[PDB]
Amino acid sequence: MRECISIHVGQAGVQIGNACWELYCLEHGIQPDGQMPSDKTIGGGDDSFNTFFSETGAGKHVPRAVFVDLEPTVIDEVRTGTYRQLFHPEQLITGKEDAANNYARGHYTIGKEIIDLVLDRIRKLADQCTGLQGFLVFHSFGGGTGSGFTSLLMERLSVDYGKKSKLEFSIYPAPQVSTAVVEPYNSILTTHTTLEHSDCAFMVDNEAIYDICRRNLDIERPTYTNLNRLISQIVSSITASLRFDGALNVDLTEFQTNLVPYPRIHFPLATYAPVISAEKAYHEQLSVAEITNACFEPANQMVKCDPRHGKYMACCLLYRGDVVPKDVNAAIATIKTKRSIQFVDWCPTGFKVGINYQPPTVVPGGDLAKVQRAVCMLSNTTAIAEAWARLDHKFDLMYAKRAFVHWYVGEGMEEGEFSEAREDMAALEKDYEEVGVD
């Protein structure tokens, strides 16, 4: 058994972290007070769920997590919320004033003054691990903390934990749920300085999550609670292999081995189905073929883009519920004959399939309906580069006029860091085009 430490940075990371650990507890039978009746080994054990939970002598199962925010109001919800008893105070770190949506403020001005404290709290979790695999880092692209402090933390984690993997869950900025105009700057600043330190990053576009909540869940104006409960289902599906007995994606290294043949191109596209409204009278349960076929529909991708016009480098299918290998292959064959699935020539045309018999857990009173089977497809498509292009374009529009640049320079960042970060993205877009286009 090898432990995984989760790090939640900024409001987006913390609130999403809130929804995941809430879901993890329901999935492992852990109550809000940390007790786990099914766990027969009191105060210890090397079970699969122990990769994410430690145990005290009193039988409490404590998440291996750290929450970091430069302002306390978001993490205060955790301290007095339903699961206030799960974590102890050392795990919840809050500053006095935030980065004001300013990458430079979170990375330099404020980050420099709190980074050593954060590493000390993480080092304490590390000291409880007999064989740490690495870290899962949750954060937004747009926030000043989520962007600026995260990139600083990632640099130090590479120094303090060289041989450890680091995966990301990153919230890509969407104007429908943002009052921030400088998020393109922050997104590209944090992507440039984090690129060499993240082994694999799962981007979620708020625009995509937003429209799934309106389309599938019939929510007219979704909230962060709606969005986060849906995001935590996708996250749970991705991390399930680390928390349950299995043989696919058993450790963080396997994510890179199976999804990232080229280091810089480490942003797999996530697709999830089915998302059914709980308020529905009663839905017809979808088959393996139907939910697998849904994995190639743009309407349920975590990032809106067209995989038909890119190339695949890898592809994992993560099933949960009543699914047998026979039916999966029957659906794959039916989909190869209907879909435009183009793999790069230097990669095998295949699918790694994982099946967990336990169907997805749904939060009581939540928006999602209980389904008999669900799948999450992780595919490394060059088509996800559309999101880099959209974002790089918005960057160029503002930077051509130096709009808002003074806010970053005023915090000690040099203007040359902008173009330096932008030129790296231009090279990232070039790498995708060399792999996908002919």
Binding site: Q11, K96, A100, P175, V181, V182, R221, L397, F404
Partner: protein
């Protein structure tokens, strides 16, 4: 705990500030004696932003009242909510400022400024995490204009990394007290350009035309004008005083509204504005149409003559948040020629469930438009009409100023006008 320190200076500044605390004290359920008596926990969630909590559950505004003569602040102390203000926070002299920027900035104001900063420092030392300052004042007088900008200069010196916001009443010859108002306004604008993060430009002629043409007030008074400013100040500060999915923070608003450090002068607006046909309900489309109508804006600048760098809108009341997004996107998608295309998604909207007193719903408008250059053009033209004949300068040279300081303020504001012009093309 993101506390704000409020300062009001001079006649206009204290009378507008007084009404401001009157309005928001009502919204938060604070009575004239500082005792809470509302019925919603929302009223107290962000109450410490503007109020200090004394013994016995007494809430005292975090406000500092400043003037160079006693008359106006005696009125406040005797006004409706006069007792609510901390007695120590009344700082005033006896000489007056004679509507003279030099007296407020260099001579009379200079003798009093240190003791004002002592109260400011005292209020800051009791803030868990000071967010920044806000100042209410006019630019056409002597105390609010000359000493007000003097206070801003010394506050930025002692708190260089805190946010400084002003509500600045711009003089107009139609609603004028003295002929030297263009002199005092030109001198102040340069201070504000250097030392404020946000300045809400309130033009007295716009306030007047609204009371006369729209509210159908036959003979408007300063009181009537100040009612518009109170309501507008309450609207723009709704972000900070009540909770909502948006995490409004003084520095965050500034970061997303000010693309260039000198272009931080905003056009505020309010809707509805109804004469006394006042009970009619206002649909979201109407609320949105009016909020973007120039007649609802208080800088007396035609936005169709310029382009919006950024726009912030606050909707108050129980309404269809979905329908809000539709109408806002409709306003942008029907007139996108008035928004710069090099700042993507530069129109942001915030909603608040608690409506103002006596209204089912309202909308407050905050525009950073290049059309504001028209306001600085008017002042510059009035300045030069007198300065070319050196008219009325002796009032200022008598207080130690030289003509060169006028020529430099003149050039400073013509540069500001030029800066707005390059971003309008």
């Amino acid at each position: 705990m993101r506390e704000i320190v409020h300062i009001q200076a001079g006649q206009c500044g204290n009378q507008i500030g007084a009404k401001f605390w009157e309005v928001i004290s009502d919204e938060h359920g604070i009575d004239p004696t500082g005792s809470y008596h509302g019925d919603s926990d929302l009223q107290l969630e962000r109450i410490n932003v503007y109020y200090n909590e004394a013994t016995g559950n007494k809430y005292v505004p975090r406000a500092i009242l400043v003037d160079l003569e006693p008359g106006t602040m005696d009125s406040v102390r005797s006004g409706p909510f006069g007792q609510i203000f901390r007695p120590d926070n009344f700082v005033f002299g006896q000489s007056g400022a004679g509507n003279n920027w030099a007296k407020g900035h260099y001579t009379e104001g200079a003798e009093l400024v240190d003791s004002v900063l002592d109260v400011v420092r005292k209020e800051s030392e009791s803030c868990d995490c000071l967010q920044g300052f806000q100042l209410t004042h006019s630019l056409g007088g002597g105390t609010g204009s000359g000493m007000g900008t003097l206070l801003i200069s010394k506050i930025r010196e002692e708190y260089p990394d805190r946010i400084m916001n002003t509500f600045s009443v711009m003089p107009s010859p139609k609603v004028s007290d003295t002929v030297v108002e263009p002199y005092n306004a030109t001198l102040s604008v340069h201070q504000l350009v250097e030392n404020t993060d946000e300045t809400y430009c309130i033009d007295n002629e716009a306030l007047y035309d609204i009371c006369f043409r729209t509210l159908k007030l036959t003979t408007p008074t300063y009181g009537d004008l100040n009612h518009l400013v109170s309501a507008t100040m309450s609207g723009v500060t709704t972000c900070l005083r009540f909770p909502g999915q948006l995490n409004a923070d003084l520095r965050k608003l500034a970061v997303n509204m000010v693309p260039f450090p000198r272009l931080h002068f905003f056009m505020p607006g309010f809707a509805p504005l109804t004469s006394r046909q006042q009970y009619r309900a206002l649909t979201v489309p109407e609320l949105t149409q009016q909020m973007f109508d120039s007649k609802n804006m208080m800088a007396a600048c035609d936005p169709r003559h310029g382009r919006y760098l950024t726009v912030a809108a606050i909707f108050r009341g129980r309404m269809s948040m979905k329908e809000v997004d539709e109408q806002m996107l409709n306003v942008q998608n029907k007139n996108s020629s008035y928004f710069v295309e090099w700042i993507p998604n530069n129109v942001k909207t915030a909603v608040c469930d608690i409506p103002p007193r006596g209204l089912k719903m309202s909308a407050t408008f905050i525009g950073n438009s290049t059309a504001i250059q028209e306001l600085f053009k008017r002042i510059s033209e009035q300045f030069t009409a007198m300065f070319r004949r050196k008219a009325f300068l002796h009032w200022y040279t008598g207080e130690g100023m030289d003509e060169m300081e006028f020529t430099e303020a003149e050039s400073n504001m013509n540069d500001l006008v030029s800066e707005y012009q390059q971003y309008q093309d």
